Write a protein that binds this DNA or RNA. Structure first.
Ligand SMILES: [Cl-]
Ligand SMILES: [Mg+2]
Length: 540
DNA sequence: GCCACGGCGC
DNA sequence: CGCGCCGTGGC
């Protein structure tokens, strides 16, 4: 019947809002409305109307809370049916999609969004009845985490603009060097960024052997996997690979970052999304912190650009081998649990079991083999891939994988048990009961079935790691406020804080303690911590 | 501007 | 070895 009533709404109303753009830190609030009992109240002047609300309840509540924080309003996010939908099925990642699946329509009008939010919340809440683990995640993780994320996004991080100018110049000079040499080898200029023009140069003009097709166009692929095979076939190949590496880094993590510095705050406001991934891991965007290269000289150079405010320090905390520890816990493998209890270098210790030698006798290459499998086993890394990674024969790679499962037989069992669970129930679950649906486990084509199988036993591990971190963020947040410290970034199994230099050390001790004790496992949780004026220094 | 796409990073 | 990111090329 569409009851309209004057602004302001009664307490408990769901909010609907329209932004000029999707990024709340950069957007104008174009419209605000609230709904309760289906009765809609539309705000005459949105910004003024914000201070009437006591919390943001509704779709994308966190995003409205971010914009409110920018304006200096304390408007914490509360109930949001996105969070409910994501717990019901993590393929539910957007309002549009949630509405299309469960009822109603995501439109561009505030009042309609508010009414929809209220409807969907009631709907999805009923759908969750009796799902006590998922409801626990909602109350103890998702809802309170949304408030942490709002604060992190609104706070942002300071960038070293002088450093970024210098890094940009350095990389530009090396890129120019490389493309000069490519054009020399090629005999003319062409657009290096064009895979079409590159294909013609490599395979038509230079006559190099093609290998793989492109996914859809059917052309001769110029991908890294193809070039890798040809590194010796022609010196231009190596140069192109270096060019692509640097250009990706510059175009993604050097050129965009200064443009992302907000004119009002002077800081970068990375956006955090808690309903975006299949596993329950948080995601970041503008920039995506997850895709900054790891363990290359280049990745390091990017993190150096992230700095503390003057008189402050960054505190970086990292859960050491958390996914393997989780695998130990879920599988119950006594030998792997022993690896973590006899706690020296974990990969050396894994190698000593694998190869049946004392830890003293493990050489660095043996350790690398163990390290590589400790991560590959989590997603069913093939012998073929391991063979490329370690540069060993295929048969030897096979033997290494078998050694691993021979020493850790309950890991082998756990993988198979998890697949049985997925095939029986149609879903798999984390330690805390976060759930992922895995329909293709019973597929016709083996190609898709194997991808489904990897997804199936990988998610419980990644998802458990994800929720340990999120639970730690929730526990840690209010205690940081006590100290005048703040939470800035989260990526992988790492958390970055900012604190006054006088309190950095105490903040580090406190954060370490809370993270390591967030939940008891069969093995200890270990947190590496460092302090520095920049993120790279603080990783040290 | 829109899009699908190859390519690359985790 | 799903998803966010880049620039390209068609519209
Ligand atoms: Cl937008
Ligand atoms: Mg051009």
């Amino acid at each position: 019947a569409l009851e309209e009533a004057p602004w302001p709404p009664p307490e408990g109303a769901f909010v609907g809002f329209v932004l000029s753009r999707k990024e709340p830190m950069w957007a104008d609030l174009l419209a605000l409305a609230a709904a309760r009992g289906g009765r809609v109240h539309r705000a005459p002047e949105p910004y003024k109307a914000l201070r009437d609300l006591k919390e943001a309840r509704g779709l994308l509540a966190k995003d409205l809370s971010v914009l409110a924080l920018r304006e200096g309003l304390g408007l914490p996010p509360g109930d949001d049916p996105m969070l409910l939908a994501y717990l019901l099925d993590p393929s539910n990642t957007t309002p549009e999609g949630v509405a299309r699946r469960y009822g109603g329509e995501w439109t561009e009008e505030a009042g309609e969004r508010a009414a929809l939010s209220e409807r969907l919340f009631a709907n999805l809440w009923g759908r969750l009845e009796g799902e006590e683990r998922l409801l626990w995640l909602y109350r103890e993780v998702e809802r309170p985490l949304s408030a942490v994320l709002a604060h992190m996004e609104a706070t942002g991080v300071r960038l070293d603009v002088a450093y970024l100018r210098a890094l940009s110049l350095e990389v530009a000079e090396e890129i120019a060097r490389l493309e000069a040499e490519v054009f020399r080898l090629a005999g003319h200029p062409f657009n290096l960024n064009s895979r079409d023009q590159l294909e013609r140069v490599l395979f038509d003009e230079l006559g190099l052997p093609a290998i793989g097709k492109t996914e859809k166009t059917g052309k001769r692929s110029t991908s890294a996997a193809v070039l890798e095979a040809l590194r010796e076939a022609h010196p231009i190949v190596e140069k192109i690979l270096q060019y692509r590496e640097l250009t990706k880094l510059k175009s993604t993590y050097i050129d965009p970052l200064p443009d992302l510095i907000h004119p009002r705050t002077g800081r970068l406001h990375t956006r955090f999304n808690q309903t975006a991934t299949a596993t329950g891991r948080l995601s970041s965007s503008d920039p995506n912190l997850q895709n900054i290269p790891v363990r290359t000289p280049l990745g390091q150079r990017i993190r150096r650009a992230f700095i503390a405010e003057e008189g402050w320090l960054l505190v970086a905390l990292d859960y050491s081998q958390i996914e393997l520890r989780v695998l130990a816990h879920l599988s119950g493998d006594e030998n792997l649990i022993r690896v973590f209890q006899e706690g020296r270098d974990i990969h050396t210790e894994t190698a000593s079991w694998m190869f049946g030698v004392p830890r003293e006798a493990v050489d660095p290459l043996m350790r690398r083999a163990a390290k590589t499998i400790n991560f590959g086993v989590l997603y069913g890394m093939s012998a073929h891939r391991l063979s490329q990674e370690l540069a060993i024969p295929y048969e030897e790679a096979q033997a290494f994988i078998e050694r691993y499962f021979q020493s850790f037989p309950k890991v082998r069992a756990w993988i198979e048990k998890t697949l049985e669970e997925g095939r029986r129930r149609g879903y798999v679950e984390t330690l805390f009961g976060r759930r992922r649906y895995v329909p293709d486990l019973e597929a016709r084509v083996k190609s898709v079935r194997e991808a489904a199988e990897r997804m199936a036993f990988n998610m419980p591990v990644q998802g458990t790691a994800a929720d340990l971190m999120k639970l730690a963020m929730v526990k840690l947040f209010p205690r940081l406020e006590e100290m005048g410290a703040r939470m800035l970034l989260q990526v992988h199994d790492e958390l970055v804080l900012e604190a006054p230099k006088e309190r950095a050390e105490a903040v580090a001790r406190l954060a370490k303690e809370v993270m390591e004790g967030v939940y008891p496992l069969a093995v200890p949780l270990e947190v590496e911590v460092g302090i520095g004026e920049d993120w790279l220094s603080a990783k040290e």
